[PDB]
């Protein structure tokens, strides 16, 4: 199934929603597009407008809140969108960062309608939408140089991993006696900017993290339990041909989808040894 020419400017993100039927894209044209794919057909449904700069990413929210989509852009702001009564409209706007926002992600539906945001300004913001609408977020300084990604850990006590341009990967946990997310662990292992970080939703004892970097390597970080440390495990002994840009875990099977710069997508799974191989 292919939807050629969804945009005329280069596209940076395409995400299907909770039912994996409703597509959504974003690119330099500074717009988002909603699609409806079936067998091998497709129908545009709208074009979201507002961002003053190329749009970097989008994330669909859990259906239990409505039909929402979040986006972030080089313009250093985040826009939420809604499809009420049959038409999309900018409900809220989040802009507390002073540089390009590169990632945005809806927390687990159990936490409510929270949003995880990371920016080149080095900070990360956590945002909920009050009873009235406005937003009173959490802002933390999380990386030097710039933050490129941030992902939520599955639900139990709330944790999320960030990936900065300081080559570091970082786990965060919420604390009461601070009313903020505090730095739980710093994981060193990349020699160049970390482009993305994905926390696997696998519900097994062991937790899985996958970080991708400008150094042409993918690292799977794992933690057996609370007393265990985060163990480093290169996805493969040899570096890759080009820069790895994204990492995505399936919802089941704990299968990793790696997006390279040689515009190639490799798939991996774990084996008896604890080493990865092509799935």
């Amino acid at each position: 199934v292919v939807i050629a020419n969804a945009h005329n400017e280069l596209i940076h993100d395409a995400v299907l929603d909770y039912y994996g039927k409703r597509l959504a894209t974003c690119s330099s044209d500074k717009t988002i597009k909603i699609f409806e794919v079936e067998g091998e057909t497709h129908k545009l449904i709208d074009t979201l407008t507002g961002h003053e700069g190329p749009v970097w990413r989008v994330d669909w929210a859990h259906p239990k809140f409505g039909t929402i989509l979040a986006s972030c852009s080089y313009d250093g702001k985040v826009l939420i969108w809604k499809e009420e009564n049959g038409r999309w409209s900018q409900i809220a706007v989040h802009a507390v960062h002073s540089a390009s926002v590169n990632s945005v992600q809806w927390a687990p539906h159990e936490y409510g309608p929270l949003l995880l945001v990371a920016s080149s300004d080095g900070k990360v913001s956590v945002v909920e939408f009050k009873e009235n609408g406005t937003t009173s977020p959490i802002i933390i300084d999380a990386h030097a140089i710039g933050v490129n990604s941030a992902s939520w850990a599955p639900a139990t006590s709330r944790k999320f991993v960030t990936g900065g341009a300081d080559n570091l990967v970082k786990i965060w946990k919420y604390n009461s006696d601070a009313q903020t997310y505090v730095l739980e662990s710093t994981l060193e292992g990349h020699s160049d900017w970390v482009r993305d970080v994905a926390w696997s939703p696998t519900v097994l004892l062991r937790s899985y993290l996958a970080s991708v970097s400008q150094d042409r390597t993918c690292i799977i970080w794992t933690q057996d339990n609370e007393q265990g440390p985060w163990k480093k495990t290169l996805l493969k002994e040899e570096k890759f041909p080009d820069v790895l840009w994204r990492a995505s875990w399936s919802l089941s099977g704990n299968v990793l989808a790696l997006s390279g710069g040689d515009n190639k997508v490799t798939l991996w799974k774990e084996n008896l040894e604890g080493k990865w191989e092509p799935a």
Binding site: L16, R246, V255
Partner: protein, 345 residues
């Protein structure tokens, strides 16, 4: 050279139904697909057998690739239950492998006892004869006289007299005591489990027109068998009492150890967990298809689990089938029911 933003990249993502979304190399197209994950395959056999209700192939599959010895019995139990049918099965499974005297010569009433009883008789006093008999160890006789009258209370005052001093020195005596007094409680609870196929016939015999009781007893026995080394047999009794719940409970407790024997068989934590839940679900489905039978939490819990593994295969149809069988009273069941709908519809 390195650059801060906008570089080209597939930007791959996974989505419900096991779909992979990525961006075409031209950087202007979106491509959704369902990658072939070696090891993961939609369950056709199950979908096709669940519709054509012919688990011959499915059963033949599990049988030919069974795991431990016990597991083999269950599938065999199901392999034969497949051909012979439920009724015919419970049959082959619950069945089993001087007059005259001519008097001669003189004789005489010797003793007071004899004389007293004899006089009673002739004097048409059949009642006293027995009293005088019992109050002596002339039970054999007491019984003979009674085996001639119609008077029930008398025709019974002796039985209760026989048992009174024998039902404890003879197993057959204790059994008679029960057959006599139309009961099974005694056998069902103390007769050696080895002779169960008997306590089995004493239930179908005493309660031939009262099914609720027939099955309450059959159950009471199954529990005893399974709890005293007769696993395979307790299942047979359950299969006849129509208590899928008991068979389910046994199988859910046997689950762990089963997933462990699989994990030691060179399989990743996932291959084991995956394979296990599948075998259990196919084993439970085929079994629930021959008995007379959801309200068990863990079973539900694990039912939901198989749903997700199925949706991830893209086989939304087989997923809905199991969705239906779950109580539309459970929210998780509710939510997934809705999700699977939109995802497929």
């Amino acid at each position: 050279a390195p650059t801060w933003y906008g570089e080209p990249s597939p930007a791959a993502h996974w989505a419900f139904g096991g779909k992979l979304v990525q961006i075409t190399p031209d950087g202007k197209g979106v491509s959704i697909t369902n990658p072939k994950i070696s090891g993961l395959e939609s369950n056709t056999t199950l979908s096709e057998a669940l519709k054509t209700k012919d688990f011959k192939p499915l059963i033949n599959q599990r049988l030919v690739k069974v795991i431990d010895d016990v597991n083999e019995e269950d599938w065999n139990l199901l392999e034969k239950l497949s051909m012979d049918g439920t009724e015919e099965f419970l049959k082959e499974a619950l069945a089993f492998d001087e007059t005259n005297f001519q008097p001669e010569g003189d004789f005489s009433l010797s003793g007071n006892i004899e004389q007293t009883i004899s006089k009673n008789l002739v004097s048409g006093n059949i009642k006293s004869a027995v009293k005088n008999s019992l109050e002596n160890d002339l039970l054999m006789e007491a019984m003979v006289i009674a085996l001639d009258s119609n008077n029930e209370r008398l025709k019974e005052s002796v039985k209760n007299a026989y048992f009174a001093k024998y039902g404890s020195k003879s197993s057959l005596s204790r059994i008679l005591y029960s057959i006599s007094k139309r009961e099974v409680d005694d056998l069902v609870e103390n007769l050696d489990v080895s002779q169960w196929k008997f306590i089995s016939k004493a239930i179908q015999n005493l309660y031939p027109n009262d099914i609720a009781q027939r099955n309450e007893m059959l159950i009471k026995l199954g529990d005893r068998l399974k709890e005293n080394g007769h696993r395979q047999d307790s299942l047979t009794l359950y299969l006849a009492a129509g208590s899928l719940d008991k068979v389910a409970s046994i199988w859910l407790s046997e689950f762990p150890d089963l997933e462990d024997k699989l994990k030691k068989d060179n399989k990743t934590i996932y291959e084991a967990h995956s394979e296990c839940l599948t075998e259990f679900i196919e084993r439970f489905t085929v079994f629930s298809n021959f008995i007379n039978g959801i309200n068990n939490e863990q079973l539900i819990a694990k039912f939901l689990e198989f749903i997700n593994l199925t949706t991830s295969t893209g086989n939304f149809e087989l997923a809905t089938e199991f969705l239906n069988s779950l109580p539309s009273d459970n929210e998780e069941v509710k939510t997934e029911k809705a999700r699977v709908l939109i995802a497929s519809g």
